[PDB]
Amino acid sequence: TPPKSCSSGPVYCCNKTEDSKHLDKGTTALLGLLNIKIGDLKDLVGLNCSPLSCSAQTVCCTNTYQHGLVNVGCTPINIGL
């Protein structure tokens, strides 16, 4: 068996995360641009995310858009000791 963490998807390293209930206007605007419905989102929104070393936020996300411009359905994950 290989090591496993996220139930769905790779671990992501996201430069920034925000609570999907308290997104700033630029983040909100960017998600509308991408046609993402805010009211159907849960947990965190990640910005500028790369699948996995991470000096920013390591998160599990259900979806990633535009090469990691925006992730959604993100929750923190600890893959250390």
Short mmCIF file of all heavy atoms in Angstrom, two decimals:
data_model
loop_
_atom_site.label_atom_id
_atom_site.label_comp_id
_atom_site.label_asym_id
_atom_site.label_seq_id
_atom_site.Cartn_x
_atom_site.Cartn_y
_atom_site.Cartn_z
N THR A 1 0.85 -1.19 0.00
CA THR A 1 0.00 0.00 0.00
C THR A 1 0.89 1.24 0.00
O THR A 1 1.87 1.29 0.74
CB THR A 1 -0.94 0.03 1.23
OG1 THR A 1 -1.54 -1.25 1.42
CG2 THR A 1 -2.06 1.07 1.05
N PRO A 2 0.56 2.24 -0.83
CA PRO A 2 1.29 3.53 -0.77
C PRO A 2 0.74 4.44 0.32
O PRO A 2 -0.41 4.27 0.75
CB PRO A 2 1.04 4.12 -2.17
CG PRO A 2 -0.36 3.63 -2.53
CD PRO A 2 -0.49 2.23 -1.88
N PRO A 3 1.53 5.40 0.80
CA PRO A 3 0.98 6.35 1.78
C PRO A 3 -0.21 7.11 1.20
O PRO A 3 -0.23 7.49 0.03
CB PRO A 3 2.15 7.29 2.09
CG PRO A 3 3.23 6.96 1.14
CD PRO A 3 2.96 5.62 0.53
N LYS A 4 -1.23 7.30 2.02
CA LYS A 4 -2.43 8.01 1.59
C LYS A 4 -2.83 9.06 2.62
O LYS A 4 -2.58 8.90 3.81
CB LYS A 4 -3.57 7.05 1.37
CG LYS A 4 -3.34 6.03 0.22
CD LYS A 4 -4.50 5.00 0.21
CE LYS A 4 -4.21 3.79 -0.68
NZ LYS A 4 -5.47 3.05 -0.93
N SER A 5 -3.42 10.15 2.13
CA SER A 5 -3.85 11.28 2.96
C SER A 5 -5.23 11.74 2.50
O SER A 5 -6.24 11.40 3.12
CB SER A 5 -2.81 12.40 2.89
OG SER A 5 -2.50 12.75 1.55
N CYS A 6 -5.29 12.48 1.41
CA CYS A 6 -6.58 12.99 0.96
C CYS A 6 -7.45 11.82 0.51
O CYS A 6 -6.96 10.87 -0.10
CB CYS A 6 -6.40 13.96 -0.20
SG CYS A 6 -5.40 15.42 0.21
N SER A 7 -8.75 11.89 0.80
CA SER A 7 -9.65 10.84 0.34
C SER A 7 -9.87 10.95 -1.15
O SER A 7 -10.10 9.94 -1.82
CB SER A 7 -11.00 10.93 1.04
OG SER A 7 -11.52 12.23 0.84
N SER A 8 -9.82 12.18 -1.68
CA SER A 8 -9.98 12.47 -3.10
C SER A 8 -8.86 13.40 -3.53
O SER A 8 -8.76 14.52 -3.02
CB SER A 8 -11.35 13.13 -3.36
OG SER A 8 -11.69 14.01 -2.28
N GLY A 9 -8.05 12.94 -4.47
CA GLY A 9 -7.11 13.82 -5.13
C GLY A 9 -5.74 13.90 -4.49
O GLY A 9 -5.47 13.30 -3.44
N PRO A 10 -4.82 14.64 -5.11
CA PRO A 10 -3.48 14.78 -4.54
C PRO A 10 -3.57 15.79 -3.40
O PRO A 10 -4.57 16.49 -3.26
CB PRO A 10 -2.63 15.30 -5.69
CG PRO A 10 -3.62 16.18 -6.47
CD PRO A 10 -5.03 15.55 -6.25
N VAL A 11 -2.54 15.81 -2.56
CA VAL A 11 -2.37 16.96 -1.68
C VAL A 11 -2.02 18.17 -2.54
O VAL A 11 -1.29 18.04 -3.53
CB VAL A 11 -1.28 16.73 -0.63
CG1 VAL A 11 -1.38 17.84 0.44
CG2 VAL A 11 -1.36 15.35 -0.01
N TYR A 12 -2.54 19.35 -2.18
CA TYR A 12 -2.18 20.58 -2.90
C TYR A 12 -1.42 21.53 -1.99
O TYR A 12 -1.66 21.59 -0.78
CB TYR A 12 -3.40 21.36 -3.45
CG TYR A 12 -4.17 20.68 -4.57
CD1 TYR A 12 -5.26 19.85 -4.28
CD2 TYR A 12 -3.82 20.85 -5.90
CE1 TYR A 12 -5.96 19.20 -5.28
CE2 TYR A 12 -4.51 20.19 -6.93
CZ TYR A 12 -5.59 19.39 -6.60
OH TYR A 12 -6.29 18.74 -7.60
N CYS A 13 -0.52 22.30 -2.59
CA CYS A 13 0.16 23.41 -1.94
C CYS A 13 -0.42 24.68 -2.56
O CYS A 13 -0.20 24.93 -3.74
CB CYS A 13 1.66 23.33 -2.17
SG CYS A 13 2.57 24.61 -1.34
N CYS A 14 -1.18 25.43 -1.78
CA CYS A 14 -1.90 26.62 -2.23
C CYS A 14 -1.25 27.83 -1.59
O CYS A 14 -1.07 27.84 -0.37
CB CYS A 14 -3.38 26.59 -1.82
SG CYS A 14 -4.39 25.37 -2.67
N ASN A 15 -0.92 28.84 -2.41
CA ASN A 15 -0.31 30.05 -1.88
C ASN A 15 -1.22 30.69 -0.85
O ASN A 15 -0.74 31.19 0.16
CB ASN A 15 0.00 31.05 -3.00
CG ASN A 15 1.30 30.75 -3.70
OD1 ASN A 15 2.35 31.32 -3.39
ND2 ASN A 15 1.23 29.86 -4.68
N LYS A 16 -2.54 30.66 -1.09
CA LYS A 16 -3.53 31.27 -0.21
C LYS A 16 -4.78 30.40 -0.10
O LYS A 16 -5.19 29.72 -1.05
CB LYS A 16 -3.91 32.67 -0.73
CG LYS A 16 -4.79 33.44 0.22
CD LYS A 16 -4.76 34.95 -0.03
CE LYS A 16 -5.55 35.31 -1.28
NZ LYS A 16 -5.45 36.78 -1.63
N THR A 17 -5.37 30.40 1.10
CA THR A 17 -6.72 29.85 1.28
C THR A 17 -7.63 30.87 1.95
O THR A 17 -7.17 31.75 2.68
CB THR A 17 -6.72 28.54 2.09
OG1 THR A 17 -6.23 28.76 3.41
CG2 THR A 17 -5.85 27.49 1.42
N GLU A 18 -8.93 30.76 1.67
CA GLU A 18 -9.96 31.61 2.28
C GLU A 18 -11.17 30.76 2.64
O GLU A 18 -11.52 29.85 1.90
CB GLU A 18 -10.42 32.74 1.33
CG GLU A 18 -9.37 33.77 0.95
CD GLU A 18 -9.87 34.70 -0.13
OE1 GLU A 18 -10.90 35.39 0.07
OE2 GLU A 18 -9.24 34.73 -1.20
N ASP A 19 -11.85 31.09 3.73
CA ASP A 19 -13.13 30.48 4.05
C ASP A 19 -14.16 30.79 2.97
O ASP A 19 -14.37 31.94 2.59
CB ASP A 19 -13.60 31.01 5.40
CG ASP A 19 -14.76 30.25 5.95
OD1 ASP A 19 -15.56 29.72 5.14
OD2 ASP A 19 -14.87 30.18 7.18
N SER A 20 -14.79 29.75 2.44
CA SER A 20 -15.78 29.96 1.39
C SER A 20 -16.96 30.82 1.83
O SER A 20 -17.74 31.24 0.98
CB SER A 20 -16.29 28.61 0.88
OG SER A 20 -17.05 27.92 1.87
N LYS A 21 -17.12 31.07 3.13
CA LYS A 21 -18.16 31.97 3.60
C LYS A 21 -17.70 33.42 3.65
O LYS A 21 -18.53 34.32 3.69
CB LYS A 21 -18.67 31.54 4.98
CG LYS A 21 -19.65 30.34 4.98
CD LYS A 21 -18.94 28.99 4.77
CE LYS A 21 -19.73 27.80 5.35
NZ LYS A 21 -19.32 26.46 4.77
N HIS A 22 -16.39 33.67 3.61
CA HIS A 22 -15.83 35.00 3.82
C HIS A 22 -14.81 35.35 2.75
O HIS A 22 -13.71 35.82 3.03
CB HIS A 22 -15.20 35.05 5.20
CG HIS A 22 -16.11 34.62 6.30
ND1 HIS A 22 -15.68 33.90 7.39
CD2 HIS A 22 -17.44 34.77 6.44
CE1 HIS A 22 -16.71 33.67 8.19
NE2 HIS A 22 -17.78 34.22 7.65
N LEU A 23 -15.15 35.10 1.49
CA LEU A 23 -14.24 35.42 0.40
C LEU A 23 -14.18 36.92 0.19
O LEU A 23 -15.20 37.62 0.33
CB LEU A 23 -14.71 34.74 -0.87
CG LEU A 23 -14.85 33.23 -0.71
CD1 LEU A 23 -15.57 32.66 -1.92
CD2 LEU A 23 -13.53 32.51 -0.54
N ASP A 24 -12.99 37.41 -0.15
CA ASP A 24 -12.82 38.81 -0.53
C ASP A 24 -13.38 39.02 -1.93
O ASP A 24 -13.65 38.07 -2.67
CB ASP A 24 -11.35 39.21 -0.41
CG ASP A 24 -10.43 38.40 -1.31
OD1 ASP A 24 -10.68 38.31 -2.53
OD2 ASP A 24 -9.42 37.87 -0.81
N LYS A 25 -13.57 40.29 -2.29
CA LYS A 25 -14.31 40.57 -3.52
C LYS A 25 -13.57 40.10 -4.76
O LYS A 25 -14.20 39.65 -5.72
CB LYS A 25 -14.59 42.07 -3.64
CG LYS A 25 -14.96 42.73 -2.36
CD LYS A 25 -15.19 44.20 -2.63
CE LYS A 25 -16.67 44.52 -2.66
NZ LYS A 25 -16.90 46.01 -2.86
N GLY A 26 -12.24 40.27 -4.81
CA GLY A 26 -11.49 39.75 -5.95
C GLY A 26 -11.65 38.25 -6.09
O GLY A 26 -11.89 37.72 -7.19
N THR A 27 -11.53 37.53 -4.98
CA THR A 27 -11.73 36.09 -5.04
C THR A 27 -13.14 35.76 -5.50
O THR A 27 -13.33 34.93 -6.39
CB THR A 27 -11.43 35.44 -3.70
OG1 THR A 27 -10.10 35.77 -3.30
CG2 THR A 27 -11.53 33.93 -3.84
N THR A 28 -14.15 36.42 -4.92
CA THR A 28 -15.53 36.19 -5.35
C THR A 28 -15.66 36.45 -6.83
O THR A 28 -16.29 35.66 -7.57
CB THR A 28 -16.52 37.02 -4.52
OG1 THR A 28 -16.26 36.77 -3.13
CG2 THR A 28 -17.94 36.44 -4.91
N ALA A 29 -15.17 37.63 -7.26
CA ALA A 29 -15.25 38.00 -8.67
C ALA A 29 -14.59 36.94 -9.54
O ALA A 29 -15.13 36.56 -10.60
CB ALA A 29 -14.64 39.38 -8.94
N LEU A 30 -13.41 36.45 -9.15
CA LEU A 30 -12.71 35.48 -9.99
C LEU A 30 -13.51 34.19 -10.11
O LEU A 30 -13.53 33.56 -11.18
CB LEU A 30 -11.34 35.18 -9.41
CG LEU A 30 -10.56 34.09 -10.12
CD1 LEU A 30 -10.49 34.34 -11.61
CD2 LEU A 30 -9.17 33.96 -9.49
N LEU A 31 -14.17 33.77 -9.04
CA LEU A 31 -14.99 32.56 -9.11
C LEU A 31 -16.24 32.76 -9.98
O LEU A 31 -16.67 31.82 -10.67
CB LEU A 31 -15.38 32.11 -7.70
CG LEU A 31 -14.41 31.17 -6.97
CD1 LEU A 31 -12.95 31.61 -7.07
CD2 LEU A 31 -14.85 31.04 -5.51
N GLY A 32 -16.85 33.94 -9.94
CA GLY A 32 -17.96 34.19 -10.85
C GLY A 32 -17.52 34.15 -12.29
O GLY A 32 -18.14 33.49 -13.13
N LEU A 33 -16.40 34.80 -12.57
CA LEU A 33 -15.76 34.70 -13.87
C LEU A 33 -15.64 33.27 -14.34
O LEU A 33 -15.91 32.96 -15.50
CB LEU A 33 -14.38 35.36 -13.77
CG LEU A 33 -13.62 35.64 -15.04
CD1 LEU A 33 -12.48 36.64 -14.74
CD2 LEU A 33 -13.08 34.39 -15.59
N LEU A 34 -15.20 32.38 -13.46
CA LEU A 34 -15.09 30.98 -13.83
C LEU A 34 -16.41 30.23 -13.69
O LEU A 34 -16.42 29.00 -13.85
CB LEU A 34 -14.03 30.29 -12.97
CG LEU A 34 -12.61 30.82 -13.14
CD1 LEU A 34 -11.73 30.11 -12.14
CD2 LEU A 34 -12.15 30.64 -14.56
N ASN A 35 -17.50 30.92 -13.38
CA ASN A 35 -18.81 30.29 -13.38
C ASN A 35 -19.00 29.35 -12.19
O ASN A 35 -19.69 28.34 -12.30
CB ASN A 35 -19.04 29.50 -14.68
CG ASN A 35 -20.47 29.53 -15.13
OD1 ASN A 35 -21.40 29.45 -14.32
ND2 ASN A 35 -20.66 29.65 -16.43
N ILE A 36 -18.38 29.65 -11.06
CA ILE A 36 -18.46 28.82 -9.87
C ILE A 36 -19.47 29.45 -8.93
O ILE A 36 -19.36 30.64 -8.61
CB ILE A 36 -17.08 28.68 -9.21
CG1 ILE A 36 -16.16 27.84 -10.10
CG2 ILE A 36 -17.19 28.04 -7.88
CD1 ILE A 36 -14.69 27.99 -9.82
N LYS A 37 -20.45 28.66 -8.50
CA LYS A 37 -21.51 29.16 -7.62
C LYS A 37 -21.03 29.16 -6.16
O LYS A 37 -20.79 28.10 -5.58
CB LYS A 37 -22.76 28.29 -7.78
CG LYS A 37 -23.47 28.47 -9.13
CD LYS A 37 -24.86 27.82 -9.17
CE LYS A 37 -25.51 27.93 -10.56
NZ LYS A 37 -26.22 26.68 -11.01
N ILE A 38 -20.95 30.35 -5.57
CA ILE A 38 -20.43 30.49 -4.22
C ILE A 38 -21.31 29.76 -3.21
O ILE A 38 -20.82 29.08 -2.29
CB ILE A 38 -20.30 31.98 -3.86
CG1 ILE A 38 -19.49 32.75 -4.92
CG2 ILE A 38 -19.68 32.16 -2.48
CD1 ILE A 38 -18.04 32.35 -5.03
N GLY A 39 -22.63 29.91 -3.34
CA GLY A 39 -23.55 29.29 -2.41
C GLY A 39 -23.50 27.77 -2.39
O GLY A 39 -23.93 27.16 -1.41
N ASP A 40 -22.98 27.15 -3.44
CA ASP A 40 -22.79 25.70 -3.45
C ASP A 40 -21.40 25.26 -2.98
O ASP A 40 -21.08 24.06 -3.03
CB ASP A 40 -23.07 25.17 -4.86
CG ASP A 40 -24.47 25.53 -5.34
OD1 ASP A 40 -25.41 25.36 -4.54
OD2 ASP A 40 -24.63 25.98 -6.49
N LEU A 41 -20.58 26.18 -2.48
CA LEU A 41 -19.24 25.83 -2.03
C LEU A 41 -19.23 25.53 -0.54
O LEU A 41 -19.98 26.13 0.24
CB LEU A 41 -18.26 26.97 -2.31
CG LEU A 41 -18.02 27.40 -3.74
CD1 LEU A 41 -17.01 28.51 -3.89
CD2 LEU A 41 -17.57 26.17 -4.52
N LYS A 42 -18.35 24.61 -0.13
CA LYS A 42 -18.10 24.36 1.29
C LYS A 42 -16.60 24.40 1.59
O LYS A 42 -15.78 24.16 0.71
CB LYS A 42 -18.67 23.01 1.72
CG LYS A 42 -20.10 23.09 2.25
CD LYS A 42 -20.83 21.76 2.14
CE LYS A 42 -22.30 21.96 1.76
NZ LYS A 42 -22.49 22.53 0.39
N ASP A 43 -16.27 24.71 2.86
CA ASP A 43 -14.89 24.71 3.32
C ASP A 43 -14.11 25.79 2.61
O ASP A 43 -14.63 26.90 2.47
CB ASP A 43 -14.29 23.32 3.14
CG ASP A 43 -15.09 22.29 3.94
OD1 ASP A 43 -15.22 22.44 5.15
OD2 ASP A 43 -15.65 21.38 3.34
N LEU A 44 -12.88 25.50 2.22
CA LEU A 44 -11.97 26.57 1.82
C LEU A 44 -11.88 26.72 0.30
O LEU A 44 -12.15 25.79 -0.46
CB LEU A 44 -10.58 26.31 2.38
CG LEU A 44 -10.43 26.20 3.90
CD1 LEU A 44 -8.97 25.89 4.30
CD2 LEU A 44 -10.90 27.48 4.59
N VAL A 45 -11.53 27.93 -0.14
CA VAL A 45 -11.15 28.19 -1.52
C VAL A 45 -9.65 28.40 -1.52
O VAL A 45 -9.12 29.14 -0.70
CB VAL A 45 -11.90 29.41 -2.09
CG1 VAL A 45 -11.28 29.78 -3.41
CG2 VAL A 45 -13.39 29.08 -2.25
N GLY A 46 -8.95 27.69 -2.40
CA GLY A 46 -7.52 27.85 -2.53
C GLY A 46 -7.21 28.63 -3.78
O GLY A 46 -7.89 28.50 -4.80
N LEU A 47 -6.19 29.49 -3.69
CA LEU A 47 -5.70 30.30 -4.80
C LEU A 47 -4.27 29.92 -5.12
O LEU A 47 -3.40 29.91 -4.23
CB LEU A 47 -5.76 31.81 -4.47
CG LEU A 47 -7.15 32.40 -4.23
CD1 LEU A 47 -7.08 33.89 -3.94
CD2 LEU A 47 -8.02 32.13 -5.44
N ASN A 48 -4.00 29.65 -6.40
CA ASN A 48 -2.65 29.41 -6.87
C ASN A 48 -2.06 28.18 -6.19
O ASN A 48 -1.11 28.21 -5.38
CB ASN A 48 -1.83 30.68 -6.68
CG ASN A 48 -2.37 31.81 -7.52
OD1 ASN A 48 -2.62 31.62 -8.69
ND2 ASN A 48 -2.65 32.94 -6.89
N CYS A 49 -2.65 27.06 -6.62
CA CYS A 49 -2.45 25.77 -6.00
C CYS A 49 -1.74 24.83 -6.95
O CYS A 49 -2.02 24.82 -8.15
CB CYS A 49 -3.79 25.16 -5.60
SG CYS A 49 -4.76 26.13 -4.50
N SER A 50 -0.88 24.00 -6.40
CA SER A 50 -0.06 23.07 -7.15
C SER A 50 -0.08 21.71 -6.44
O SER A 50 0.15 21.64 -5.22
CB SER A 50 1.38 23.62 -7.23
OG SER A 50 2.20 22.72 -7.96
N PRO A 51 -0.37 20.63 -7.14
CA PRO A 51 -0.33 19.31 -6.48
C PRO A 51 1.09 19.01 -6.01
O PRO A 51 2.06 19.41 -6.64
CB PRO A 51 -0.82 18.34 -7.56
CG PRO A 51 -0.61 19.07 -8.88
CD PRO A 51 -0.62 20.54 -8.60
N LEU A 52 1.20 18.35 -4.86
CA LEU A 52 2.49 17.94 -4.35
C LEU A 52 2.85 16.56 -4.92
O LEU A 52 1.99 15.67 -4.94
CB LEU A 52 2.47 17.88 -2.83
CG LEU A 52 2.56 19.18 -2.03
CD1 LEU A 52 1.20 19.84 -1.99
CD2 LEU A 52 3.04 18.94 -0.60
N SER A 53 6.94 19.10 0.25
CA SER A 53 7.47 20.45 0.21
C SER A 53 6.37 21.50 0.06
O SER A 53 5.84 21.67 -1.04
CB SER A 53 8.49 20.55 -0.94
OG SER A 53 8.03 19.86 -2.12
N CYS A 54 6.11 22.27 1.11
CA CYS A 54 5.13 23.33 0.97
C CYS A 54 5.31 24.34 2.09
O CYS A 54 5.01 24.05 3.25
CB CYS A 54 3.70 22.78 0.93
SG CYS A 54 2.41 24.05 0.64
N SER A 55 5.72 25.54 1.73
CA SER A 55 5.83 26.61 2.72
C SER A 55 4.53 27.39 2.90
O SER A 55 4.46 28.23 3.80
CB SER A 55 6.94 27.56 2.31
OG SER A 55 6.91 27.81 0.91
N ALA A 56 3.49 27.08 2.14
CA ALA A 56 2.20 27.75 2.26
C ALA A 56 1.20 26.80 2.89
O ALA A 56 1.48 26.27 3.97
CB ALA A 56 1.80 28.31 0.89
N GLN A 57 0.00 26.62 2.32
CA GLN A 57 -1.06 25.80 2.91
C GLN A 57 -1.17 24.47 2.18
O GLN A 57 -1.38 24.44 0.96
CB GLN A 57 -2.41 26.54 2.84
CG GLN A 57 -2.44 27.85 3.57
CD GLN A 57 -2.20 27.68 5.04
OE1 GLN A 57 -2.94 26.97 5.70
NE2 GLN A 57 -1.17 28.30 5.56
N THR A 58 -1.09 23.37 2.91
CA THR A 58 -1.31 22.06 2.31
C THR A 58 -2.77 21.69 2.56
O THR A 58 -3.27 21.79 3.68
CB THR A 58 -0.37 20.98 2.86
OG1 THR A 58 -0.47 20.88 4.28
CG2 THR A 58 1.04 21.35 2.57
N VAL A 59 -3.46 21.36 1.48
CA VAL A 59 -4.90 21.14 1.54
C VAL A 59 -5.28 20.02 0.59
O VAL A 59 -4.62 19.79 -0.43
CB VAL A 59 -5.74 22.39 1.15
CG1 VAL A 59 -5.72 23.43 2.25
CG2 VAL A 59 -5.29 23.01 -0.20
N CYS A 60 -6.38 19.32 0.95
CA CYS A 60 -7.13 18.44 0.07
C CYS A 60 -8.29 19.21 -0.54
O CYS A 60 -9.00 19.93 0.15
CB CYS A 60 -7.68 17.25 0.85
SG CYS A 60 -6.39 16.34 1.70
N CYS A 61 -8.46 19.10 -1.85
CA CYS A 61 -9.52 19.81 -2.53
C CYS A 61 -10.28 18.88 -3.45
O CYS A 61 -9.73 17.94 -4.03
CB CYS A 61 -8.94 21.00 -3.35
SG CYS A 61 -7.89 22.09 -2.38
N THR A 62 -11.57 19.15 -3.60
CA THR A 62 -12.37 18.34 -4.52
C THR A 62 -12.14 18.75 -5.97
O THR A 62 -12.08 17.90 -6.86
CB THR A 62 -13.85 18.44 -4.16
OG1 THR A 62 -14.32 19.77 -4.31
CG2 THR A 62 -14.10 17.99 -2.71
N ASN A 63 -11.92 20.04 -6.22
CA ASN A 63 -11.71 20.48 -7.58
C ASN A 63 -10.62 21.53 -7.67
O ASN A 63 -10.39 22.30 -6.74
CB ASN A 63 -13.00 21.09 -8.18
CG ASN A 63 -14.13 20.08 -8.24
OD1 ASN A 63 -14.86 19.88 -7.28
ND2 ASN A 63 -14.25 19.43 -9.39
N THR A 64 -9.99 21.57 -8.84
CA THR A 64 -8.93 22.50 -9.17
C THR A 64 -9.24 22.99 -10.58
O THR A 64 -9.64 22.18 -11.43
CB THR A 64 -7.56 21.82 -9.12
OG1 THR A 64 -6.56 22.76 -9.51
CG2 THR A 64 -7.52 20.59 -10.03
N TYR A 65 -9.12 24.29 -10.80
CA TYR A 65 -9.51 24.90 -12.06
C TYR A 65 -8.37 25.71 -12.63
O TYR A 65 -7.59 26.32 -11.89
CB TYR A 65 -10.71 25.80 -11.87
CG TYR A 65 -11.89 25.10 -11.26
CD1 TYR A 65 -12.33 25.41 -9.99
CD2 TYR A 65 -12.56 24.11 -11.97
CE1 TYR A 65 -13.44 24.79 -9.46
CE2 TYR A 65 -13.64 23.46 -11.43
CZ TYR A 65 -14.09 23.81 -10.18
OH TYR A 65 -15.19 23.17 -9.62
N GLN A 66 -8.28 25.72 -13.95
CA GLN A 66 -7.32 26.56 -14.68
C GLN A 66 -5.91 26.37 -14.14
O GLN A 66 -5.21 27.33 -13.79
CB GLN A 66 -7.72 28.03 -14.62
CG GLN A 66 -9.06 28.37 -15.21
CD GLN A 66 -9.14 28.03 -16.67
OE1 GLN A 66 -10.13 27.48 -17.14
NE2 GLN A 66 -8.09 28.35 -17.39
N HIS A 67 -5.49 25.11 -14.05
CA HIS A 67 -4.13 24.77 -13.65
C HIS A 67 -3.84 25.21 -12.22
O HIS A 67 -2.70 25.56 -11.91
CB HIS A 67 -3.06 25.41 -14.55
CG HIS A 67 -2.65 24.58 -15.73
ND1 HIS A 67 -3.55 23.82 -16.46
CD2 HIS A 67 -1.45 24.41 -16.33
CE1 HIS A 67 -2.92 23.21 -17.44
NE2 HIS A 67 -1.64 23.57 -17.40
N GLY A 68 -4.84 25.24 -11.36
CA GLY A 68 -4.60 25.63 -9.99
C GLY A 68 -4.78 27.10 -9.70
O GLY A 68 -4.44 27.55 -8.60
N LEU A 69 -5.32 27.87 -10.65
CA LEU A 69 -5.68 29.25 -10.35
C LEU A 69 -6.57 29.31 -9.13
O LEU A 69 -6.37 30.13 -8.23
CB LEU A 69 -6.41 29.85 -11.55
CG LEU A 69 -6.36 31.35 -11.80
CD1 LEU A 69 -4.93 31.81 -12.06
CD2 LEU A 69 -7.28 31.71 -12.95
N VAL A 70 -7.61 28.49 -9.13
CA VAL A 70 -8.61 28.43 -8.08
C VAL A 70 -8.83 26.95 -7.79
O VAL A 70 -9.01 26.16 -8.71
CB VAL A 70 -9.94 29.09 -8.50
CG1 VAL A 70 -10.97 28.99 -7.38
CG2 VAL A 70 -9.74 30.51 -8.86
N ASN A 71 -8.75 26.58 -6.52
CA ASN A 71 -9.30 25.32 -6.04
C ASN A 71 -10.51 25.59 -5.16
O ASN A 71 -10.63 26.66 -4.55
CB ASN A 71 -8.27 24.53 -5.23
CG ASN A 71 -7.18 23.95 -6.09
OD1 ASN A 71 -6.96 24.40 -7.21
ND2 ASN A 71 -6.49 22.96 -5.57
N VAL A 72 -11.38 24.59 -5.03
CA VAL A 72 -12.55 24.69 -4.17
C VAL A 72 -12.72 23.35 -3.47
O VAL A 72 -12.10 22.34 -3.82
CB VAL A 72 -13.83 25.08 -4.94
CG1 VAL A 72 -13.62 26.48 -5.61
CG2 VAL A 72 -14.24 23.99 -5.92
N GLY A 73 -13.57 23.36 -2.45
CA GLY A 73 -13.78 22.20 -1.61
C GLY A 73 -12.51 21.82 -0.87
O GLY A 73 -12.23 20.63 -0.71
N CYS A 74 -11.72 22.81 -0.46
CA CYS A 74 -10.43 22.54 0.14
C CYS A 74 -10.54 22.53 1.65
O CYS A 74 -11.21 23.39 2.26
CB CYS A 74 -9.43 23.61 -0.26
SG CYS A 74 -9.08 23.73 -1.99
N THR A 75 -9.86 21.55 2.25
CA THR A 75 -9.71 21.40 3.68
C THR A 75 -8.24 21.17 4.01
O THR A 75 -7.52 20.51 3.26
CB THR A 75 -10.53 20.21 4.22
OG1 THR A 75 -10.26 19.04 3.44
CG2 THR A 75 -12.04 20.44 4.13
N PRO A 76 -7.78 21.68 5.15
CA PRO A 76 -6.39 21.43 5.52
C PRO A 76 -6.11 19.96 5.77
O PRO A 76 -7.01 19.14 6.06
CB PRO A 76 -6.18 22.28 6.77
CG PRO A 76 -7.51 22.78 7.19
CD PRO A 76 -8.56 22.37 6.20
N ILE A 77 -4.85 19.62 5.58
CA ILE A 77 -4.33 18.27 5.66
C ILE A 77 -2.89 18.38 6.15
O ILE A 77 -2.15 19.30 5.77
CB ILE A 77 -4.41 17.55 4.30
CG1 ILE A 77 -3.98 16.08 4.41
CG2 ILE A 77 -3.48 18.22 3.29
CD1 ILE A 77 -4.98 15.23 5.07
N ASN A 78 -2.52 17.46 7.01
CA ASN A 78 -1.18 17.44 7.59
C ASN A 78 -0.50 16.18 7.13
O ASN A 78 -0.87 15.09 7.58
CB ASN A 78 -1.26 17.48 9.11
CG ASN A 78 0.11 17.29 9.79
OD1 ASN A 78 1.15 17.10 9.13
ND2 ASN A 78 0.09 17.34 11.11
N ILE A 79 0.52 16.29 6.29
CA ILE A 79 1.18 15.08 5.81
C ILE A 79 2.57 14.90 6.43
O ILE A 79 3.37 14.10 5.94
CB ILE A 79 1.24 15.02 4.28
CG1 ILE A 79 1.91 16.25 3.69
CG2 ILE A 79 -0.17 14.94 3.72
CD1 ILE A 79 2.23 16.04 2.24
N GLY A 80 2.85 15.59 7.51
CA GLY A 80 4.07 15.40 8.25
C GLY A 80 3.95 14.30 9.28
O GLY A 80 3.07 13.44 9.21
N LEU A 81 4.83 14.37 10.27
CA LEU A 81 4.91 13.37 11.33
C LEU A 81 3.69 13.36 12.20
O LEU A 81 3.19 14.44 12.53
CB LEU A 81 6.13 13.65 12.18
CG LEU A 81 6.79 12.58 13.03
CD1 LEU A 81 7.37 11.57 12.10
CD2 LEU A 81 7.85 13.20 13.96
#
